[PDB]
Swiss-Prot record, chains A, B, C, D:
Recorded GO MF terms: RNA binding
Family the UniProt entry places it in: Belongs to the phlebovirus nucleocapsid protein family.
Domain of life: Viruses
Protein name: Nucleoprotein
Binding site for RNA: 28, 31, 64, 68, 106-107, 187, 197, 200, 207
Domain notes: The N-terminus is involved in homooligomerization.
GO CC annotations on file: helical viral capsid; host cell endoplasmic reticulum-Golgi intermediate compartment; host cell Golgi apparatus; host cell nucleus; ribonucleoprotein complex; viral nucleocapsid
Alphabetical UniProt keywords: Capsid protein, Helical capsid protein, Host cytoplasm, Host Golgi apparatus, Host nucleus, Ribonucleoprotein, RNA-binding, Viral nucleoprotein, Virion
Phylogenetic placement of the source organism: Viruses, Riboviria, Orthornavirae, Negarnaviricota, Polyploviricotina
Species whose genome carries this gene: Toscana virus (Tos)
Function description: Encapsidates the genomic RNA, protecting it from nucleases. Displays high affinity for single-stranded nucleic acid. The encapsidated genomic RNA is termed the nucleocapsid (NC) or ribonucleoprotein. The ribonucleoprotein has a non-helical structure. Serves as template for viral transcription and replication. After replication, the nucleocapsid is recruited to the host Golgi apparatus by glycoprotein Gn for packaging into virus particles.
Effect of residue 28 to A: Reduced RNA-binding affinity
Length: 244, 244, 244, 244, 244, 243
């Protein structure tokens, strides 16, 4: 009968190689970092622009005004809103979370994370969640580099002695306060309830294939998250503790 | 008079044998595993495809991305989403819990449970609830084979020495954490409250008539839950205790 | 003047006989037991079926799966759901509480109560509220015949020494637990609050004109609630006490 | 100057006679008892019917099934609903509280109150609020004649020693329980809060000019509320006390 | 343009012309001059005794409220015919509309020297009866004060703080009036209800239509004060009981 | 590959100067004070009116009756409402928070803040929150601070952190003002109400219309600061009571 067909699957092949190949091909992917790095350089250069300057502007714009380019234009200076109007036109910018071939301010920050991680140190007080606010929650001075969701793309979870998990918990402390500020609906809700709202896309970002373990290592050292002896920074271990 | 006809039913036969035969035939049955095993083969072979490879893919897809094929396509790689688009077209896939003659990713997992129970061992960390997360709750290394609701179709409750009840309690430990991850609304709610949400469909799955007690015995022995002498594993007894 | 006309109604006839005749003709009903016994016989015999076998099946089906025939089909065996599909087609079955000329599984149980009262004794553990569960609440073994709302149509409240009232209180003990199981919204509610939710339709059922006091007496004796000397069973008097 | 015009109204006439004449002409009414007694007689006699029999039916129907003729038809016997369909057609019956020239079951009971006050004594247990329920609240046996809002049209507030106020308080005890039963929204709310919901239409009904003080006295005596020497019943005074 | 805005530092800010603007722009509500004018204008144009019509509109407002369209449906055919004519001529509306719109409450407010007289003859036909008000105060409450429009007669700047005592005396009625108008405030505390009408009553007492001298004449006319500016004994008792 | 391009951004310039220049150019505004000062003068002079008198009237009107010109007309004197009808017609006045080229009573008070700050001293008792009410909560509270438009005069980058003390002093009024404007926040906690106006006030204080030197002169003229940058005693008390 058909029960025999289903039971016959006990002797059917289950190759860990081809299964993990399928897992990677089927896994959660909000957007392709390779595609938007490509679409930025191609669209920006075709419109004869310093696309490298535009990404720095789009990252500054994202960090301080959000991911709604059309909305932020109305409540901005005439000179500033003229730049934003040009950035929307050239890079075909959109709001929220659209398709894989669509560029958003949040995505530019995510794919070009080696610059966004630098920019965070100079405009920490102009952020939705200010640096001083974040310093009060953590106790010790919270790492400015971690003060944006795009930091997740730098986290290497497979780091020896479970260092990557401690970093993910440290960054989660910010993510909770960030979510409460972005959507005030979650301001009264419990800490673990808010943690589950960003758990899936952050995990997908940390498990990213764009930057290698070695690239992530160099980036994590560069912004002082880990010392030369691969040991974590004292503020990062405090933020992971306060996360619970 | 019609009152006489209704009263005449006092002398009408009420055979406990034929009534219990009707009770069993009218009982609650989640889906027809025979029909979906049939429709996968029929639809798959008609579109000249390796339907046996397709079920493996559909199971991998269900274990790692869920039961909404249309929704998971939008947040996936172009190569991956192209495979999913083909699987929806051939197998006429749908979402949630529709009619008996409708195929869903969760149903393919459930009916072809002898394969999915093997696949779970290689992609335990790619699951919504990771294996290492499940190991922390249980204390001892939690059985990977049990880390999906479809495992219920392998459970034989009528096992001697009440072994089937111990297995159902062991699988329930996962089901609680799985439900909290699927719907984050139940993350703050009490353990016994979450247990009642999946109690009825799991019981209906365990009381299934597709696989016989002998087939279930072979499957439970194969995956390593019980030995040939029908003795539960060191971890399956720990998981059932931590369940309370 | 019109004051005269209205005042003239003081000497106008108000015969308690013709008023109670109107009260009975105008009273709340929901459905006509004579009409549904007629329609089952007429529809069943027209479609050349053993309609007497069908009513037993419809009763078994109602007791164990409810009053939604379309819904219960989807979560049932292919053989079982094929029988239900045939029963819906011939008897033009519907859900909930429709018109007086519409047949429902609950109505078949209500009008053919002399057979349903027998069926309850053999499938007591397959009921939404099991017999053993009912035995725990009552203390003494609860009468299986009373374990369905349709039992109300057999209750004669005008029984000497107020025996009928004791039966209505005994049946109410089940009705409370039955309501809490049917709608879990009433689970946390107080006992007297749940009692008022079914008080009106049960009273209307108990005041029914289909079965005469003599027919009700025969029915109540037939299922061991009372004996020829109108002495009601000890379990029935215990259930009425526990009802408070 | 316009301030002079307004100030000139200090010397303008304020005749208590013509003001009370206006108060009576402007006071809250609802419907005209003369008009509905007329329209029942006119519509009834035009359709060649015993309209005097029909009002007794409409009253019985009203007391036991309410004021929604279309709604009560669906949950009634085929013979009964056929009578109601005829009564709606002839008397152009409507629901709730419409215009002055519209007939409703509640208005027929109000208009023809000398006949409804009699009917209440024979169908006290078939009422929405049963007589025995009303006896429990009052302590002493509550007057059956008072167990309907239409009783208000018999109350004479201008009775010596303020007897009319004591009757209005006794009838209010029923009105509270009646309102809670009609609309279950008011069941949990405070006694004085529910009292204000029916205070205005009841006051308008008691202040009625249809029946004279002498007619009201005769009616109040004929249904044992008072005697020839204007001394009220012991149950009415108890009901007025329990009202607070 | 920054120079133009900064030049306003040397620009004139005359306290005289600013306070002249403040008085001209301050919160008025309705214009009593305009509605006295429009009543006299519209009334005389439709060849009516507009002086009789204002007394009718005042009687109508005191006993039936401010919704002319609504009160028509629940009124006598003769009465509702007068109200239909008054709406047509004086273009009457509901609630609180524009400054050039006439409402029953506004007619009572602007022609307060006549409304204050009418209150003495229909005290028992008011929403809050005079006898009810006599029970609360402990002394016979002034009938003239038994309407919110009385506030337009109060002169707060009266020597020895007499106006404040009158305001407190009128507040005792206003509390009971508010509880009757909106039964939502029936259970709420005395000081909580006092704040709901505090702002519009204060605005009414600070009114510019009647001068201190006109207010003195009006307060003298309806026995609140005498020639010597001495306050009535019932008015000082009502102000004391106000703090309850 | 493209991973190399993204990694190359590690050596790409991140100059705090040009970044803060972008931050200022991209920051939240609401309306353009230059544009509304222009539109008032242009529309006012085109209708042959003393537009300088009209702004003082619009400011008085805003301070005492709010930002809904159509609504305040219905509950006003015939002479007063006639002036308001003319002001709406000439200056094309609107309600709430519309576009950058739209004039509102609140915007006239904000852009012409050097006059509104003077007007506040003479009509302090006619304000939604009276001056005497504000004196009770605080020492005599500065009348100049008794309106949200005062924020446009605050210079947060003042030495010894003087600007921050002024922002805390003005916040004491803003809390009581918010509770009066929306009675929904009357029972709510002090820090909860403080967060409702924190974002637009910060955006107003960080404004580029008036320079640090202009702001210094303004705060000096209305006695919050003296020619030696030392704070007024009432301003330091209001900042303390703010917590």
């Amino acid at each position: 009968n058909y029960r025999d067909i289903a039971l016959a699957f006990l002797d059917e092949s289950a190759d860990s190689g081809t299964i993990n190949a399928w897992v990677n091909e089927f896994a959660y992917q909000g957007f392709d970092p390779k595609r938007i790095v490509q679409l930025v350089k191609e669209r920006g250069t075709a419109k004869g622009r310093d696309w490298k300057k535009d990404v720095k502007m789009m990252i500054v714009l994202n960090l301080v005004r959000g991911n709604k380019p059309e909305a932020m234009m109305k409540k901005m200076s005439e000179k500033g809103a003229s730049i934003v109007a040009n950035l929307i036109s050239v890079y075909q910018l959109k709001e929220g979370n659209p398709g894989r071939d669509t560029i958003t301010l949040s995505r530019v920050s995510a794919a070009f994370v080696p610059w966004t991680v630098q920019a965070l140190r100079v405009l920490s007080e102009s952020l939705p969640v200010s640096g001083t606010t974040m310093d009060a929650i953590a106790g010790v001075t919270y790492p400015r580099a971690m003060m944006h969701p795009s930091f997740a793309g730098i986290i290497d979870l497979d780091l020896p002695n479970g260092a990557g998990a401690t970093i993910a918990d440290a960054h989660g402390l910010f993510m909770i306060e960030f979510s409460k500020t972005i959507n005030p609906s979650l301001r009264t809700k419990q800490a673990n309830e808010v943690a589950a709202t960003f758990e899936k896309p952050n995990m997908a970002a940390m498990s990213g294939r764009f930057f290698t373990r070695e690239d992530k290592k160099k980036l994590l050292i560069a912004v002082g998250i880990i010392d030369e002896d691969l040991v974590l920074a004292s503020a990062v271990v405090r933020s992971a503790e306060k996360y619970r």
